[PDB]
Design an enzyme around this catalytic site. Sequence first.
Site, PDB file in Angstrom:
ATOM      1  N   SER A   1       2.244  21.872  13.479  1.00  0.00           N
ATOM      2  CA  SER A   1       3.259  22.773  13.998  1.00  0.00           C
ATOM      3  C   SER A   1       2.695  23.504  15.208  1.00  0.00           C
ATOM      4  O   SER A   1       1.490  23.756  15.289  1.00  0.00           O
ATOM      5  CB  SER A   1       3.702  23.786  12.931  1.00  0.00           C
ATOM      6  OG  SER A   1       4.535  24.786  13.494  1.00  0.00           O
TER       7      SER A   1
ATOM      8  N   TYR B   1       2.371  30.093   6.554  1.00  0.00           N
ATOM      9  CA  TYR B   1       2.643  28.777   7.117  1.00  0.00           C
ATOM     10  C   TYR B   1       1.675  28.413   8.244  1.00  0.00           C
ATOM     11  O   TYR B   1       1.177  27.281   8.295  1.00  0.00           O
ATOM     12  CB  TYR B   1       4.088  28.738   7.615  1.00  0.00           C
ATOM     13  CG  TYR B   1       4.468  27.439   8.276  1.00  0.00           C
ATOM     14  CD1 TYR B   1       4.664  26.288   7.522  1.00  0.00           C
ATOM     15  CD2 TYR B   1       4.657  27.368   9.648  1.00  0.00           C
ATOM     16  CE1 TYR B   1       5.010  25.092   8.122  1.00  0.00           C
ATOM     17  CE2 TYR B   1       5.014  26.178  10.258  1.00  0.00           C
ATOM     18  CZ  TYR B   1       5.194  25.045   9.491  1.00  0.00           C
ATOM     19  OH  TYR B   1       5.553  23.860  10.091  1.00  0.00           O
TER      20      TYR B   1
END
Lengths: 247, 246, 247, 247
Positions: A142, A156
């Site tokens: 990501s 995350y």
Amino acid sequence: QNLNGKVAFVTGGSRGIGAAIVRRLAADGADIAFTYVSASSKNVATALVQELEAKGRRARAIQADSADPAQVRQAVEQAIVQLGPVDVLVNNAGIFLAGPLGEVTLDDYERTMNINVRAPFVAIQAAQASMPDGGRIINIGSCLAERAGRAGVTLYAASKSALLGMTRGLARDLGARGITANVVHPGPIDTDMNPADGERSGELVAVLSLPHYGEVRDIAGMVAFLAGPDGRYVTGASLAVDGGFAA
Amino acid sequence: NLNGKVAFVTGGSRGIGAAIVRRLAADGADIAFTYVSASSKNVATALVQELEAKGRRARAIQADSADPAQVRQAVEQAIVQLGPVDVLVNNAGIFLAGPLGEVTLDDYERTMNINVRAPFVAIQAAQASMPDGGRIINIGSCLAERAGRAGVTLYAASKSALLGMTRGLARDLGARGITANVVHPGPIDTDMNPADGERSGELVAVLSLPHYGEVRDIAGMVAFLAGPDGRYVTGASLAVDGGFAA
Amino acid sequence: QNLNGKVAFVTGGSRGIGAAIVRRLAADGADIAFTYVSASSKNVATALVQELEAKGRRARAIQADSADPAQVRQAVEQAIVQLGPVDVLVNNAGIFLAGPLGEVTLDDYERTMNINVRAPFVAIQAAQASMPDGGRIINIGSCLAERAGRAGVTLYAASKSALLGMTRGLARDLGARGITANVVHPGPIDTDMNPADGERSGELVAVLSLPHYGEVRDIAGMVAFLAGPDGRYVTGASLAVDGGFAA
Amino acid sequence: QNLNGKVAFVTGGSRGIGAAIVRRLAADGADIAFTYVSASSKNVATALVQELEAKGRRARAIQADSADPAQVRQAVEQAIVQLGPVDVLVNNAGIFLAGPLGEVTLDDYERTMNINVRAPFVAIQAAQASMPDGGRIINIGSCLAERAGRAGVTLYAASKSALLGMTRGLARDLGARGITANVVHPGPIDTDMNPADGERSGELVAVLSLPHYGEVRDIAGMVAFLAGPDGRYVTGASLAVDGGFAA
């Protein structure tokens, strides 16, 4: 074609980015085994398998909860028996659990780390030994692994930046056999989970260099590039496909 | 592919640059490329016939990279003859290495004029007419991110300058859909850097992959960024280094 | 006072961040030579010397335009004959030329590169030969070297990112002698030249992790840390002092 | 005396790098609580507490296995009651499980991630709610988080690189309160577990810019800088103290 003789394994391939990857890799001539987590995903996974076989490509769908290491491992084992050793491993499954820092629970932490970190590591442990020389390991990261632009994504971003060190360590571990290990970092992507029409889409677009969400074909194109002949000397790298989010 | 697009490549007559111009031409781009010395004329013109004899338009333009006027007018001549550039590849560069106390002001000027000013001049000349969705692809070095040894301070400084230039260009041009990226080659088997070299074994020992790369490795990365699959990649640094940085 | 008996050289030390650096290094006991670029700054520079002298420190103020390599070099040479070899070199002088990419001129490029890159490399070359073991080289960068974040900073970001590779190369060239080389990246800093009250201050503060501009003492404190005994094992590093601009 | 009136909490403070951190923070005037993992460390930890007290500092040693989140959390709560709200949290405890990629076990993965990742996150979650404005969170990483460099450290590099994203998200999560969050990356450091004269030391030293191992005081000085007034505007940063390992 480029991937004609190759076997690919893709976790979470029944939908979204995972479905785009299996379509692109199959269109390049690879056989693909892919996993789906929920039983509700089973029918669409079977539909996708029938779709690939109507174009002459071999395909397999194997259910496997990403949270369960035993299921991820035995799914890779089943793929190997049916198709042969995997040449291209794509760790695509992941989950996005976000929110205020004081409200994070141990259940949030355990699920995020088991799916975003442990499952790619288990699939790699099961696949790596039989991986032929010149194989490819492709983790999906990501843009938040490199830049947490806002509050609320601590858990995350930690799970995704764990992939950076794992990928660099894998490149050293397997490089003597010619196996590459790379991580792709999507920016915002128009999926069922993250629609481009969302209310927060404008806040995200404003911080990009390119003023729009990307598409799943962008991630699948990067993955196909790493899987193919032109990616043979790329290893240990972090490759953003983020619309200039980091620029 | 690159049908209908014009590509410009500095230093395209040789090595990595020749592989880039050939790969881009095979994907359907018209190509202009530069060569430094007039002595390279024979190789460059042969490459042009090689390109034209495959269905592409092509031009070879003399331009010393050290002279900002020559880089700029080479870009200007290409846009009149071929049309506005869609793909700019700043490949030309120089590698001056050695002990820090022996570096001269002449070494500084040549390294900075060729490795930094020339890419910036070519960009400034091309960017105004660059059509939407165009591509700027700088060629860097693994030494921009990791020096790893003594004796390459000046070269690593000039190449790490591309990192900030490339990220700033991604912001400056993103509204038009133009991407800006820098590719960082590792050791590559060329005439300037043979894989059979004197110091080859020590360099190969710090790679994850136990060998030098080939010019096709850089050409494929540039073709990816130039093409449809690179439309959402911008402001990125992409190593093709055999795991040198891992 | 950990710097007693050491000589420090600071380019652009008559004002702002450079003035805070020279004051901090002098308060730690270093004798200091510093440059001023314009002749118009002369009296403020001479006043700074009188201030250091009135505290028991030896000090020198030397005129030198950063664009002229010969002036930077002879300023370092003059400091070495008058004060002795330089133990701590701080390359602080720089310029911020900003604007639309289509309006940047070749003169904008020439001055930015002559000042932001060449002058620090020239001062380092002049100082490095006689630098005692355990010496310190400290370049001042920018958060824009690592993240542009907005349009219009292309050239400035390029000149500052050049320091990143230069600093890493210098750490390798000089590490055997125990000399460290690091670059400090200020974030927004409240100076007369860069007010925290400016019209553009609000756009910067909104993207920070700490919602305010920094102060010149924050840069001087990082530089004092790298200069001293606690910095002896820090080399080749890029150290942000940016309020979380890099997230 | 920069830490007069501050309470510091340090995991794994009984020895090595953690003991140098507790001694340095105490010498700067902080009251200190620290944990020890093994029951065998009880005597050393209590002796260190006696050493601090004899010098006018308040100090406490708390047994807490890093693998058990409830013990980590209860140690932070006990420190808050006995010493007060924590101003400076230092997550130092960690484990180095290294070896060939094919010999890694699921147990190795579970212990590495529970100690190196979950434990710092649990300690932060317990401290953050009562943490006063201007507090400091300082995670201890590794140079291997940013560069693996050799085969056999894949798992450890992954767990440490997870701290990179966790730290950047924490900087966004807590910046509005003035709390900074940073990660320090040791290079080779001379400790009991990693002797500087031990086998393979020459292999590592050869790749450094400074041709020697560092000392525990080098890590402690960096942590003291970040804890103090000079660290007020540093947040979200990765700070190598690696001897130029990454250069």
